[PDB]
Design a protein around this ligand. Structure first.
Ligand SMILES: [N]C(=[N])[N][C][C][C][C]([N][C][C]C(=O)O1[C]([C]2O[C](N3[C]=NC4=C3N=[C]N=C4[N])[C]([O])[C]2[O])O1P([O])(=O)[C]P([O])(=O)OP([O])([O])=O)C([O])=O
Ligand SMILES: Nc1ncnc2c1ncn2[C@@H]1O[C@H](COP(=O)(O)CP(=O)(O)OP(=O)(O)O)[C@@H](O)[C@H]1O
Ligand SMILES: N=C(N)NCCC[C@H](NCCC(=O)O)C(=O)O
Ligand SMILES: [Mg+2]
Ligand SMILES: [Mg+2]
Lengths: 500, 490
């Protein structure tokens, strides 16, 4: 009875003094322009959303008949908490309206209260607000100049224009490979004066730098409770969600929580002609009695996802692109209706899932560095899945779960010789023993690294070779306006190798 | 011990080459086992305490020496993450045990009121508590690291490269103040430093129903105060008629089972009547001290000398507090204050509309570092130790995080704190809302508005260059002439 997918996946909005640009998105869906009642003084916007579901809940307007409009891509998770701090009403219907009602009470500080997965733009008179969620999980880009502000959930839609009129902004980073396009920082709200094109940015969240010791038993129960809540908030009542499942504790944990929340669950696992964790996942599938699907794709197909992954994430970090190849392939391979998907992605970051020794200092060093450098990588962008029409959400990076996991002392993250111990302990009563204490996972190269090595690229120049390949795929797809389908990936890789 | 093992220090680590503090107390130079290649230091402490617990040594990793000024409050928590069972002697040793397990990240775990310097081999660590409540300064050059809890001891000296992530002390040269909530990792040989922040104000806000918010605030304050009260010893609370100090008084009384209070007044105003209500409700041993406005202003050079602050507004807040600590009679005391509660709770906010409350809150939290308004020297200059419950790391994190509607609610300021103490204080106290001698001084010497706030900055800066920069005792500074010169200079 309730909408299973967000009211809108993305948008291209515009606020200009005068004038009057068809959006090109990687995100799949209907393109619907919102009404512009105040004419040139209104906020113009094209929303990309789930076909057949009108995007009404992604737009909100003034209740006093004034020039104030808000557009929101994504969704909010702590709705009951937010509803509890609002005056008489009326009861907001949709997240854009919830945001607007909150802005009426706290102005821009409203964003310090929201725990969600969204990107939003608001125009009030000649003031424009742009805001991201705490982790910038829904990328938001902008082109600001005196008299005109353009904002979009995909940089490519802003670059599609001839020489975007975008200039430097406080806290906003210039997008490499593009001109005039800047990315709004994660956990922030930019307050823009339309006339001058100047902006003041306020951060609404930042990774904790301190660590808090809690009674052991309590810490473990707290992690389980927070994960259970975050997952429940992400599951639509009346709809059985899909969990992308691996053999690891991360995705297994989300599956256990999701099954409890929905009463039933669907799971899917992807594998290649070289490796898979089908047996490991089946252990959880049988334990939970889920409707499971196994998908095997040749390595040539997985690597064929290179341009799609770059095009969707608009990221140029080769390491990140590699993590995304498998997921990009999985989302495109799914058959049937558009799904609400939950993943165990991200757990490794605050927990130092890569740490491999009992010594704790290096774990905190890496963790702190990771939390200070995730912004701009766009690794959890919804476009990765929406390019195929599916919505994805990541429980481990829920603001409450994230704050808690980041804050725990290192001895809880690496213990008894096991990685992410606190998470394994938190779920030890909901999963089979083998899943709970099976090590995270020696000479094995990634298929992307293998691809360059198979081209005869010296192994010490492979990583830089991968960086150059991605860089060129970005220039063709995001900067050039070329569709992934039109990219001769082989030629690109061959070219980079021939110059290495 | 009722007082910390050390109030402050002047330390150094170099190759092989005393101090004068505002802090009142004994001086003890620690042993130098490794000779010229060890950590040399002069600790200033209460005559009644052994400085031993303020120094710890070990051979773990390399010859190591730690010096710590102040104290740690979440000791039980810290002890819970350590191996074996040989409990540390004091806080300096506790830090050393933590460093062995988490290295510099150990500081991300500490909730205290301290400043510490550690030398392990040719590596030097300089660390402050989350709020930098105990100022720490340093001079860093290749082969020479000097650290002090008072810039004045470092100003009295020649060399000291620029430290990027730290702030230069006003007027002084080569002297830097270690940022709050940070640990500076220095390589002695190269004189290069890397600074890691171990705490930062939360920017997000939390939503909680009244009942839970009220209960959490009460529980957090009770704990932070219990941690600050020595078992067996009755503490002293500097009490005004306000909810902040009253809230601390109620918690300290509960924790100590007894309580000593003191309120100060001037010939201009006082809150003796307001405080009396609380004095009787908790039945404490109360004392009222009235200081002439003339004596209040005479504190100008003492407050600058002790706080080493150049901020006129902060200096004015500190004049009465400084007069009070110096006027206290009897033995050295462990004192708790309700200072700082207005910052995270937006105590100065006067409207029901919330936007401005959060704007000022975020700004205040991003700019408190360097003001030194809660420095222990303000009270130790008179032998007394102060600690501030509201800026306890746990209490602070909680109060800062609360959504504005819990701070301004039912038309009352700092609502959640008032509600949290409702069942421990008289109704009038929790219900009475929150609601310049210095200025009057300058106006007497001739100076217009828009020229007074400015002139005050010049007076404060002059006193600083004299007492902190020139190593001249406050008792030797004519605050009358300082005003004179600065007066006929605008
Ligand atoms: N940083 C920033 N931004 N700011 C800062 C500011 C500060 C504030 N406050 C104000 C000033 C002061 O001083 O204050 C405090 C404390 O101290 C003490 N005292 C005072 N006075 C006095 C005292 N004692 C005794 N006597 C006299 N006279 C106390 O303890 C306190 O706590 O405070 P206040 O605020 O002023 C008062 P209260 O008490 O708190 O109450 P209410 O409620 O009215 O407020 C801050 O702190 O923040
Ligand atoms: N082959 C595959 N099949 C199904 N889902 C997959 C997958 N590879 C990755 N995922 C999803 O993408 C996320 C990224 O995660 P990874 O860290 O690489 C494995 P993990 O499932 O998190 O377990 P682990 O990190 O404890 O080993 C997972 O949480 C999972 O939901
Ligand atoms: N942003 C980063 N620093 N890293 C993102 C990596 C994504 C990571 N999965 C792979 C496991 C690993 O090798 O860390 C995760 O947290 O799901
Ligand atoms: Mg993982
Ligand atoms: Mg106060």
């Amino acid at each position: 009875g309730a909408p299973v997918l967000p009211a809108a996946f993305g948008f291209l909005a515009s606020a200009r003094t005068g004038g009057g640009p068809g959006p090109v998105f990687a995100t799949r869906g209907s393109h619907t322009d919102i009404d512009t009642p105040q004419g040139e003084r209104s906020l113009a916007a094209t929303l990309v959303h789930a076909p057949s579901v009108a995007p009404d809940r992604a737009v909100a307007r003034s209740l006093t008949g004034a020039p104030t409009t808000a557009v929101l891509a994504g969704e909010i998770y702590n709705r009951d908490e937010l509803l509890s701090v609002l005056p008489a009403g009326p009861a907001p219907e949709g997240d854009a309206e919830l945001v607007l009602r909150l802005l009426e009470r706290y102005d821009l500080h409203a964003f310090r209260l929201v725990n969600g997965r969204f990107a939003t733009v608001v125009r009030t008179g000649d003031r424009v607000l742009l805001a991201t969620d705490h982790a910038g999980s829904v990328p938001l880009y902008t082109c600001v100049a005196p008299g005109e502000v353009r904002a979009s959930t995909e940089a490519k839609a802003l670059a599609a224009h001839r020489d975007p009129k975008g200039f430097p902004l406080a806290d906003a980073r210039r997008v490499a490979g593009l001109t005039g396009v800047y990315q709004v920082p994660a956990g922030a709200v930019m307050d823009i004066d339309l006339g001058s094109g100047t902006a003041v940015t306020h951060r609404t969240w930042t990774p904790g730098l301190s660590r808090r010791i809690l009674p052991e038993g309590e810490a473990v129960a707290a992690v389980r409770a927070a994960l259970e809540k975050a997952v429940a908030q992400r599951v639509t009542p009346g709809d059985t969600p899909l969990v992308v499942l691996s053999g690891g504790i991360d995705s297994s944990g989300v599956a256990a929580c999701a099954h409890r929340a929905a009463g039933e669950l669907d799971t899917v696992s992807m594998g290649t002609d070289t490796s898979n964790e089908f047996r490991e996942a089946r252990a959880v599938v049988d334990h939970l009695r889920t409707r499971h699907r196994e998908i095997t794709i040749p390595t040539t197909e997985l690597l064929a996802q290179l341009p799609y992954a770059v095009w969707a994430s608009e990221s140029v970090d080769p390491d990140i692109i590699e993590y995304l190849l498998p997921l990009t392939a999985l989302y495109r391979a799914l058959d049937g209706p558009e799904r609400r998907i939950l993943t165990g992605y991200g757990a490794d970051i605050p927990l130092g899932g890569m740490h491999r020794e009992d010594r704790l200092p290096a774990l905190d060093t890496v963790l702190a560095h990771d939390m200070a450098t995730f912004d701009g990588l766009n690794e959890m962008s919804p476009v990765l899945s929406t390019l195929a029409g599916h919505w994805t959400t990541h429980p481990y990076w829920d603001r409450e779960v994230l704050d808690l996991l980041v804050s725990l002392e290192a001895g809880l993250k690496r213990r008894h010789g096991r990685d992410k111990w606190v998470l394994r302990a938190a779920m030890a009563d909901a999963l089979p023993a083998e899943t709970v204490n099976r090590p995270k996972l020696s000479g094995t190269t990634s298929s992307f690294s293998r691809l360059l090595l198979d081209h005869g690229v010296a192994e010490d120049r492979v990583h830089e070779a991968k960086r150059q390949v991605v860089r060129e795929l970005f220039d063709l797809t995001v900067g050039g306006g070329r569709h992934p389908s039109e990219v001769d990936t082989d030629d690109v890789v061959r070219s980079v190798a021939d110059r290495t």
